[PDB]
Amino acid sequence: VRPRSDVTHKQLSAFGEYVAEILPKYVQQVQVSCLDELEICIHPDGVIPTLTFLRDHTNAQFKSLADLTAVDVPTRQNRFEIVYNLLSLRFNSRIRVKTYADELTPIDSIVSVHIAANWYEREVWDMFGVFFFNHPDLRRILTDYGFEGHPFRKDFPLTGYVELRYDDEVKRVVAEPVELAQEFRKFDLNSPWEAFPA
Amino acid sequence: TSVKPIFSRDLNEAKRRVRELYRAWYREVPNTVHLMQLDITVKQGRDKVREMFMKNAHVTDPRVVDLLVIKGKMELQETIKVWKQRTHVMRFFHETETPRPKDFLSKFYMGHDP
Amino acid sequence: LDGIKDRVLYVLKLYDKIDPEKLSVNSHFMKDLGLDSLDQVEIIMAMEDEFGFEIPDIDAEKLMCPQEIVDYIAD
Amino acid sequence: RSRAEYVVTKLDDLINWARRSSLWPMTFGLACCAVEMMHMAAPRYDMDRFGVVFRASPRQADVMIVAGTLTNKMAPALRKVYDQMPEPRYVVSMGSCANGGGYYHYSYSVVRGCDRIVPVDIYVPGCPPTAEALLYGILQLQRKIKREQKLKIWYRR
Amino acid sequence: NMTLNFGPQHPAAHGVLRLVLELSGEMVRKCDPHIGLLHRGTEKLIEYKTYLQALPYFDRLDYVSMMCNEQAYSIAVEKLLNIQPPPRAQWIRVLFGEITRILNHIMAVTTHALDIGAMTPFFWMFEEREKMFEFYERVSGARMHAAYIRPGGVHQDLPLGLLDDIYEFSKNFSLRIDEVEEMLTNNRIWRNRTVDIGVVTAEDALNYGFSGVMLRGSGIQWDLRKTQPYDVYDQVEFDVPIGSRGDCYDRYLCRVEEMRQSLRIIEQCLNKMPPGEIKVDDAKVSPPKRAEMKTSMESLIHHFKLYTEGYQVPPGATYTAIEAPKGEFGVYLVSDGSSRPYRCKIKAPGFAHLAGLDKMSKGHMLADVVAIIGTQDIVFGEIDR
Amino acid sequence: MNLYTVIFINILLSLTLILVAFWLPQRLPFSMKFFLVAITFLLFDLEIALLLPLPWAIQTIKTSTMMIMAFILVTILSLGLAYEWTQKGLEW
Amino acid sequence: ASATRVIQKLRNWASGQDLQAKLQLRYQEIAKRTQPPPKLPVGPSHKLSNNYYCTRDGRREVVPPSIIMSSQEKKAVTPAPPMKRWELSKDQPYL
Amino acid sequence: AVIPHGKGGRSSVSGVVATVFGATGFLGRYVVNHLGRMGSQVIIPYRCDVYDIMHLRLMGDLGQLTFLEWDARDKDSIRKAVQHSNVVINLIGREWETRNFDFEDVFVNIPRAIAQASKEAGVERFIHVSHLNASMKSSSKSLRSKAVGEKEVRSVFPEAIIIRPSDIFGREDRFLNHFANYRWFLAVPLVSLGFKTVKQPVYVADVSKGIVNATKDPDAVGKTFAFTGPNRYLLFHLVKYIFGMTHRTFIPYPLPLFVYSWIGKLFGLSPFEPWTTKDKVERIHISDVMPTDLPGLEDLGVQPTPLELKSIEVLRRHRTYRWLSSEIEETKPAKTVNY
Amino acid sequence: TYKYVNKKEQESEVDMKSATDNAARILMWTELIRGLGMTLSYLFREPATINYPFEKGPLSPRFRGEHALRRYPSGEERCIACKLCEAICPAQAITIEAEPRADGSRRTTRYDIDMTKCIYCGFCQEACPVDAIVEGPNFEFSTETHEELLYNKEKLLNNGDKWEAEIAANIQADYLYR
Ligand SMILES: NC(=O)C1=CN([C@@H]2O[C@H](COP(=O)(O)OP(=O)(O)OC[C@H]3O[C@@H](n4cnc5c(N)ncnc54)[C@H](OP(=O)(O)O)[C@@H]3O)[C@@H](O)[C@H]2O)C=CC1
Ligand code: SF4
Numbered sequence A: 001v002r003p004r005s006d007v008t009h010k011q012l013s014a015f016g017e018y019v020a021e022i023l024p025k026y027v028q029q030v031q032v033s034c035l036d037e038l039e040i041c042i043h044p045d046g047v048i049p050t051l052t053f054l055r056d057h058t059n060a061q062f063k064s065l066a067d068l069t070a071v072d073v074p075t076r077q078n079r080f081e082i083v084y085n086l087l088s089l090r091f092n093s094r095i096r097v098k099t100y101a102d103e104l105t106p107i108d109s110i111v112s113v114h115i116a117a118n119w120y121e122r123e124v125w126d127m128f129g130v131f132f133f134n135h136p137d138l139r140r141i142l143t144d145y146g147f148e149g150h151p152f153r154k155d156f157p158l159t160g161y162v163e164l165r166y167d168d169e170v171k172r173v174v175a176e177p178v179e180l181a182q183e184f185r186k187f188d189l190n191s192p193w194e195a196f197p198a
Numbered sequence B: 001t002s003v004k005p006i007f008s009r010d011l012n013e014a015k016r017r018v019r020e021l022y023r024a025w026y027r028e029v030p031n032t033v034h035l036m037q038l039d040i041t042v043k044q045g046r047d048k049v050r051e052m053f054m055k056n057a058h059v060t061d062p063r064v065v066d067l068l069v070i071k072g073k074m075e076l077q078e079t080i081k082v083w084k085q086r087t088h089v090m091r092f093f094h095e096t097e098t099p100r101p102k103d104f105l106s107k108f109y110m111g112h113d114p
Numbered sequence C: 001l002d003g004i005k006d007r008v009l010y011v012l013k014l015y016d017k018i019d020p021e022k023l024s025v026n027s028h029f030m031k032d033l034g035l036d037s038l039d040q041v042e043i044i045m046a047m048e049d050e051f052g053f054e055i056p057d058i059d060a061e062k063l064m065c066p067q068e069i070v071d072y073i074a075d
Numbered sequence D: 001r002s003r004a005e006y007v008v009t010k011l012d013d014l015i016n017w018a019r020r021s022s023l024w025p026m027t028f029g030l031a032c033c034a035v036e037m038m039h040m041a042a043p044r045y046d047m048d049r050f051g052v053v054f055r056a057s058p059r060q061a062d063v064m065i066v067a068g069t070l071t072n073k074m075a076p077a078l079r080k081v082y083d084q085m086p087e088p089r090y091v092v093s094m095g096s097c098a099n100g101g102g103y104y105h106y107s108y109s110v111v112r113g114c115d116r117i118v119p120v121d122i123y124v125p126g127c128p129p130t131a132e133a134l135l136y137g138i139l140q141l142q143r144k145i146k147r148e149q150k151l152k153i154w155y156r157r
Numbered sequence E: 001n002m003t004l005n006f007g008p009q010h011p012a013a014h015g016v017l018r019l020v021l022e023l024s025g026e027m028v029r030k031c032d033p034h035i036g037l038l039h040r041g042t043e044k045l046i047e048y049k050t051y052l053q054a055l056p057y058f059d060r061l062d063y064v065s066m067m068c069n070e071q072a073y074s075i076a077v078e079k080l081l082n083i084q085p086p087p088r089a090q091w092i093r094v095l096f097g098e099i100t101r102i103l104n105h106i107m108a109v110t111t112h113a114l115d116i117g118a119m120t121p122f123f124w125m126f127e128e129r130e131k132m133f134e135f136y137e138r139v140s141g142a143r144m145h146a147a148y149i150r151p152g153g154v155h156q157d158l159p160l161g162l163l164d165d166i167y168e169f170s171k172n173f174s175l176r177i178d179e180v181e182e183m184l185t186n187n188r189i190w191r192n193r194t195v196d197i198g199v200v201t202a203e204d205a206l207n208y209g210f211s212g213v214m215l216r217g218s219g220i221q222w223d224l225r226k227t228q229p230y231d232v233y234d235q236v237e238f239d240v241p242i243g244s245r246g247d248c249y250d251r252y253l254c255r256v257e258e259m260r261q262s263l264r265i266i267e268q269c270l271n272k273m274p275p276g277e278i279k280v281d282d283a284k285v286s287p288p289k290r291a292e293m294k295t296s297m298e299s300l301i302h303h304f305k306l307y308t309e310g311y312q313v314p315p316g317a318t319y320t321a322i323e324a325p326k327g328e329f330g331v332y333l334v335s336d337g338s339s340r341p342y343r344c345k346i347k348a349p350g351f352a353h354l355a356g357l358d359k360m361s362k363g364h365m366l367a368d369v370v371a372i373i374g375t376q377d378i379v380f381g382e383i384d385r
Numbered sequence F: 001m002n003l004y005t006v007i008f009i010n011i012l013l014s015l016t017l018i019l020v021a022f023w024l025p026q027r028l029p030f031s032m033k034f035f036l037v038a039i040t041f042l043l044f045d046l047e048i049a050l051l052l053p054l055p056w057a058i059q060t061i062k063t064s065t066m067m068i069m070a071f072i073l074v075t076i077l078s079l080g081l082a083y084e085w086t087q088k089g090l091e092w
Numbered sequence G: 001a002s003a004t005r006v007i008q009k010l011r012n013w014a015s016g017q018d019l020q021a022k023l024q025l026r027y028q029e030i031a032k033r034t035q036p037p038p039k040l041p042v043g044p045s046h047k048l049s050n051n052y053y054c055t056r057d058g059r060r061e062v063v064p065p066s067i068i069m070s071s072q073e074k075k076a077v078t079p080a081p082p083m084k085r086w087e088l089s090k091d092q093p094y095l
Numbered sequence H: 001a002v003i004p005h006g007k008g009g010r011s012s013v014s015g016v017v018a019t020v021f022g023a024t025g026f027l028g029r030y031v032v033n034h035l036g037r038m039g040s041q042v043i044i045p046y047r048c049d050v051y052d053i054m055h056l057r058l059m060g061d062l063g064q065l066t067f068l069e070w071d072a073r074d075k076d077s078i079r080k081a082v083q084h085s086n087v088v089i090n091l092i093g094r095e096w097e098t099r100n101f102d103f104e105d106v107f108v109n110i111p112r113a114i115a116q117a118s119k120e121a122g123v124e125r126f127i128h129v130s131h132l133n134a135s136m137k138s139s140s141k142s143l144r145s146k147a148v149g150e151k152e153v154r155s156v157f158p159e160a161i162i163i164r165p166s167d168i169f170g171r172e173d174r175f176l177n178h179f180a181n182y183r184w185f186l187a188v189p190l191v192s193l194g195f196k197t198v199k200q201p202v203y204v205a206d207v208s209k210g211i212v213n214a215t216k217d218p219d220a221v222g223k224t225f226a227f228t229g230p231n232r233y234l235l236f237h238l239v240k241y242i243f244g245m246t247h248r249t250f251i252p253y254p255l256p257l258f259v260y261s262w263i264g265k266l267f268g269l270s271p272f273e274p275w276t277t278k279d280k281v282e283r284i285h286i287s288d289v290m291p292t293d294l295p296g297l298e299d300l301g302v303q304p305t306p307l308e309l310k311s312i313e314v315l316r317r318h319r320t321y322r323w324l325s326s327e328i329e330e331t332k333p334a335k336t337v338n339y
Numbered sequence I: 001t002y003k004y005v006n007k008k009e010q011e012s013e014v015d016m017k018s019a020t021d022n023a024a025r026i027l028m029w030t031e032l033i034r035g036l037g038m039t040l041s042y043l044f045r046e047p048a049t050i051n052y053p054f055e056k057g058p059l060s061p062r063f064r065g066e067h068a069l070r071r072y073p074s075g076e077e078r079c080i081a082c083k084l085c086e087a088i089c090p091a092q093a094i095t096i097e098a099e100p101r102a103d104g105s106r107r108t109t110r111y112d113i114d115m116t117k118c119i120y121c122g123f124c125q126e127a128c129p130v131d132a133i134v135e136g137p138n139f140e141f142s143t144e145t146h147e148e149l150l151y152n153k154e155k156l157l158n159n160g161d162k163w164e165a166e167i168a169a170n171i172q173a174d175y176l177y178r
């Protein structure tokens, strides 16, 4: 069983309250995991304001953006859950600010607050389809130039719909609808028995 | 209802943007067919542009339209700032794939699940 | 101006869909000769070439009859 | 010996020896298999010894080792580089990522094999196909190049 | 600024990078790196695989640092389960964690030189690399792509005799680093092509999320291994090699210095590795020993369920970051109660570094761009994921 | 003639190779810096010329004038270089 | 190794280092193969007594995240104590 | 038989196991392409070294293309190739009578033995390909010999389809490249100054698709289809047009054929694949026959494709940097001759 | 603990002697000559390369190499088709379908390892209860055609019979560790 120090779960908890108090217009929920990690949750409109306070506040300097990601809970009305993980080299602590964005309700861009996000925001658009206003140059980064569809969405087939082969007749690479020679065997793995109350 | 506007307050304003993109593509088709040495006819290509711009003619919601041009603009950028080579462009024409008939009798004769 | 009008008519005559017969300086293809919204935009584009003059959409949308085109081309 | 057949067998044996002894490898350095060859180029298993030069520009390149996954964004390129290589040319597909899709077979962004994009001569198996294993594969290309009898076919054609 | 589309010309490699650029003659006006030439789906594929069958993906994410990456997923899965590895396993992971850092730096310093044009350092140190691989093989079975560091500790104890050889090598490797030095650290020419090229300010490095030697080279003192200790990197003693006048030459010197400091950490690990088990004793998380599964029913049931279904991690989400040789490697692993993960964004030290290429290579010549891609140790696997 | 004999063999040897080589198998890159260099190059190349007769001129009876002349030429060109350095020229 | 002394001396000098002492090629110093059979140690939890799993299963004793500030005088508090400045090394401060 | 399952693309099954003896050819390449695309089992008998048939491997899927070593003189090789095929397609042909193979062999002798065995095997259908306008009396030995074959094979294999294509238009074809390559020649000889030899080209693919469709259609038995084209042409426009797209000067100068047959004889003497053939020459000035016959394209399901449409791709390699970017629209079209 | 690399502790004021030493370093390329000495030194060292066909780079018992299916000494193939080797394969490589053999025993009618799909993780070696599927030592199985790489039960069983003697020795050496 991992060793857990409650010093952190107390320090981080307090900070959470501090952030919440300072930014009550946007903070909806602020929780600390059992793993000693804080996760302020903000209304999408608070993207710019909450980050800026953390990047430039003496009692909470969160200078670098570790990551910007978007889990996709299809059930959730607001499908995407943009999560921004930040690090404070001054206070040696990380916080995560997570917002919610639906497919056609764009989030603001923080390239202003952290220029690290210039690329990750393009990554989130390419994979999940969330759009970021005021982004300097939003354009697909990881997917092919002509790719249609946002791949990491839970509703996108793994194999996808198009695959490439070289055709002599046309002497050029050519998409064709995917035809797989051994479909992905979809093993069902969930057991019908729960583990604990959680 | 009660939705927030992405970039266009109403289908009207949005349509303005579509007009601009159409023009953009229309003016660009010829250049691509020459800078990519594509074996297509400018007229032919320009019809394709029309095809696509109408494939999505049914959309009534302003927000959906706005994203559609954002995406459309991005595609143009990849074809005028050329990062998309012929293989990419010609794919639009679906040149190699064999067309599938939509006639019931046709499908019956060929596929288990139509 | 008549020559300009001829240029306008000339362009239209060239466009495929437009029917030379229905064509008249008072024809409004958007509503009369049956040209689609997108087609009207395309027409303006050809005019922009023939007349080497650029037309903003705001105004271009307003131009749906050849004569109207002539009028704008005029100014 | 005296026979137009014997002279045409010996001379290809000569032509085949030259191509076999000096194969310059063009290494599409995709993924990690490129490292497992950078180890072949390195001192434990020198490739130069065998006449295979460390690196030659595509235009100068008798073999193409495709190491690593061929995504659907690099495919259109591989074909170009294969198409721009000089005629006598051979392809060695290294890695379960390249000869077949390997882990990442079912991905939407990975071509399931480079055989779909470029004709492949020897398929070297293994996630990081070992460096001797590539060296065995390059030596197998040399056995394939010895067997080829182009002059004999032209004579009896 | 005639776009040259350089990089599909295999000129700096490190993977396949189409660095579309606009160059007024030999001066670079703007660099827009293109990525995804190696996107393969690693993040989506993992959602369809169980925790233990997604471990091999992490070795492939950035395969020059094969294991260090595995430690990041391990740690992450251990946190979610609130399980910790046994004491011997921790030291192992730090032992092979460091050996891996050397392997990455030998790659980064020598491959940097090959693009610059110095070719003999690569052959000198690839022989040492080779010798290290053999450690991997005799511990895992694979030269690279081992799968040795699993979510609950190591897979199998070290062979009976490895430690001694990881000593002979370490006892000598120094001289090998020393040699490279006598060839490049003070070359009258290495300095020129490297010094004052790609200087990055301290404030800008934190802003663009550089988080690696790239920060350390600018003088910011941050080693996640000292600031936020993971495993038993706390019990060892090493000196972070901070740099000043951050530029390609200074950071280099830093990478040669961590090669040196890692030998200090490896020595200790050999001197103080404890007797013990190498995997958690919870058959719940770690697979049962094969003698046990072949003689005890509870062990077979636990072997069958673990291999066929999985850990069944409790629902939660964590971002755990280690100090991979390139920089901060972190896995944000959201997890439902299921045996297969829900999301696993891999933070790649490299997605941030490439982005900086634009703000680093400004008003620079074609050769400068080649030098800067080297000073970022870009492995396109981690960036493309 | 002796040279002519050698040279034509020299061309023949090369033309032979290329011929067999082809028979056996059976837009705006401009930087003033580059132009500027070419120019400087000739200004220096011309000077090389005015300096080439120096081996014959060494034996000139004058000697004093020879050196006085040669030293002036080398010094004035070098000053040309000096101003090239001082100006952005030679600073690519 | 196996180098005539003179070559070694030239080697050591040209390199500036006693490369002979630390040769890269391995000779009869590497662990012999077929090292003896290993009897590895069994860890904790193998006790046959007082080994109840319920008392050793951190996997699911974990609880749902603690929640603060849910939507459904006071001193300032930092994310954590301000970090402590690292200290220059003592074996080799510089270089 | 093999029930056809799948969606229609590679990695799917169509149930056509087909020996195709002359696949390495220009037409062949295309035949294997569609057969492979459709998912058919294709056995490719080959004689040239493996290096040359690599271009066929990526076509078709794994275990869908099988290559067998085969010698025309050796009857046994043909025997085993058709052992397990149910469709045999014969594209064996050449323009230059080679030292060890005469026009008879390549057209009539060999293509007989082949279908002969195919019957012994019990192949459902055999498709034999012979040149268009092939009289048993036509001037060119080639055409006449081909005619001789289409007869014989009918006795070895009754109800064997006999598609009879015109000279083919396609990248890597001769009809179009040959003329374009006259550039090397300062002057481009044209018998009768390229007149009175109206010609109707047909795109290679059209021919291929047609051939493939034959394999999978009961309507074609004993049918002698004629894939022709979408427009005829006096050789004059064709020649100039070509030179037009190639953007190289066109200098039509008439040359008495009697003398020209001699020029063909000259290159014909060439050891390495004579570029022109006495038998070629005649063929080139052999007027295309009229279209009154079992229709081919369209009849078999593919609408012909006009020459001008794809000419740009076939003739592009012959242009110079100056004209590379130039496009079809810039150039003019040639004129047809219903005559 | 930190360490400054490339930080000049202080400003040594130029002393003629110092200046000369430096100027000589630039003028007579002294450090460049230092670098040449290092390479000349190795030229005299023994090269580390191995004759690849004649000598082979050492691989210890755990090397995963090429898949093989083992058989009991009696001659009964070890696999009993529990099919969890299929379950834990990360790449979906192994395909197994089974039916009760005439003897009544459980056996696999078809066992197909797609080696191009396989990423040689070695978990199958791990997972098998009877340890029927093992990672065999051979790494040299490069094949001219893609189909040869796909392996059915007969190739793997044959691979198992050919390398059984070494596989048994390798498993013998490493089983205590596992
Ligand atoms: N313009 C055209 O192409 C037209 C063609 N046709 C007919 O269509 C058929 C295909 O034409 P095309 O592809 O251009 O012909 P090619 O010149 O391309 O050769 C076709 C194939 O026949 C094989 N072949 C030729 N001679 C022999 C032989 N003696 N023994 C074994 N195989 C042989 C060749 O194999 P290899 O190269 O390995 O020897 C080649 O793969 C021909 O038979 C021709 O009569 C009809 C009208 C027009
Ligand atoms: S094959 Fe294994 S090693 Fe080679 S690239 Fe694909 S994954 Fe990396």
Ligand code: SF4
Pocket: I078, I079, I080, I081, I082, I083, I084, I085, I086, I096, I127, I128, I129, I130, I131, I132, I133
């Ligand atoms: S696990 Fe071992 S035994 Fe069970 S099926 Fe796979 S191979 Fe046969």
